[PDB]
Amino acid sequence: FNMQCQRRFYEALHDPNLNEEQRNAKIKSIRDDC
């Protein structure tokens, strides 16, 4: 992935303030956009 999307995934992964469902949904949303 391009640097923007790459960093978005990296951040979202390393953000346990989000739980399993929330975090996987975040990754999915970023991946849909990217």
Side-chain angles (χ1 to χ4, degrees):
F1 284 98
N2 60 80
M3 298 301 179
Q4 184 189 251
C5 289
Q6 189 184 127
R7 286 174 292 182
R8 286 161 57 189
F9 295 122
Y10 184 74
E11 178 56 64
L13 289 169
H14 312 326
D15 184 15
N17 301 95
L18 293 276
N19 65 41
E20 183 179 85
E21 297 180 275
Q22 292 172 337
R23 181 153 46 180
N24 281 258
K26 176 55 55 57
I27 296 289
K28 184 178 179 180
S29 301
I30 294 160
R31 194 144 293 172
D32 181 81
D33 175 73
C34 291

